[PDB]
């Protein structure tokens, strides 16, 4: 009866739905893709997940970020016969495969800093907003994206 994959994705998508960045159906397709193309990435402090479609049902590029106090199993992006305990989730709403690849490459650099992840595990919605907002600013050649404080949410 603890948090389940569908809940995080639906939770994360709600402000994107509410703000018009993706279509209303968008979460159900993220969930389908997670069954088919899992996005669980083992990392230093805690596990990471990047639920995303390949651009379907996305209307303006946006991101929503979710922090989990208790870990949740997401099947690994790479095959390991070992589920990934996730506490950080990056929901991607990107339309262009070209733009996609840039954003996941930027995603990687963020994950490699473990103390940032340790910080994000104990930080406020406002703190994670302006911290992430800055990293988007400090990211070069990154496409235009949409990030608001509502896009930051604690879960579970």
């Amino acid at each position, epitope marked *: 009866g603890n948090v389940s994959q569908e809940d995080i994705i639906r939770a994360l998508a709600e402000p994107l739905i509410d703000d018009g960045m993706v279509e209303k159906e968008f979460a159900d397709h993220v969930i389908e893709r997670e069954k088919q193309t899992p996005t669980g990435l083992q990392a230093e402090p805690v596990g990471v997940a990047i639920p995303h479609t390949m*651009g379907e049902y996305v209307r303006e590029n946006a991101i929503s970020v979710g922090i989990l106090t208790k870990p949740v199993n997401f099947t690994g992006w790479y095959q390991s016969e070992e589920p990934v305990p996730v506490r950080v989730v990056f929901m991607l709403a990107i339309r262009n495969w070209f733009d996609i690849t840039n954003v996941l490459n930027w995603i*990687k650099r963020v994950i490699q800093d473990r103390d940032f992840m340790r910080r994000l595990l104990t930080m406020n919605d406002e703190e994670i907003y302006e911290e992430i907002y800055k990293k988007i600013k400090q990211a070069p050649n990154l496409t235009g994206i949409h990030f608001t404080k509502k896009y930051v949410r604690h879960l579970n």
Partner: antibody
Amino acid sequence: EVQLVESGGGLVKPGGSLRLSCSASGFDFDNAWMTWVRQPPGKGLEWVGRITGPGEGWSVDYAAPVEGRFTISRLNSINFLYLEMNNLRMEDSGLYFCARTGKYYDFWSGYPPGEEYFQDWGRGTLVTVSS
Amino acid sequence: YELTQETGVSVALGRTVTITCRGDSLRSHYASWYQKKPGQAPILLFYGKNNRPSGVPDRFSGSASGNRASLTISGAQAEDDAEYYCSSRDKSGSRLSVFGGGTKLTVLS
């Protein structure tokens, strides 16, 4: 399963025009990337160009030799891929295939814009340019 | 050719052979491999880090290192007597694609 039929090749003279067509079945054509490849007689595969999907605005990328002379297009309501060729030369003769094109980007070690691979091909259509 | 392949390579039935593709883009991009027989459509064999399509025999395998991508056949057979092409981006960061010259594989069967 996947079926790709090419059509439109044939005998044509220098400076002429030709429209090639490819009919697709057995997969999600409307959202797939589609590629034209050619093989001159005696020679190797040569990448011609590639049309993307709806998220990419159906943008097309062209090999430098054919840029400005060939146009790639699609009709997703009948699952057709087209290559319209103008100012054809002998140098353009050979056997043309459509390929279904996948997208690959490894997360930890990949570098954008990833790599494109060709998971299904047709048997091809022959375009002969001679005088 | 940004991608360079041996013009031709020969091998004995049941023996192991490796074909290589060399280029600067291969230091930043993986490569895929295709088999091409006369009068026949190319067959995709291998792509990415360790991606072998369902249906390709397991005797086919890929590897990359530096500016060099390579394909290996383990227990070569007469059906593997064919022509072999690599593909990758031309430059680092490019939306265009290129094929190597090709390698004629002769399985002395």
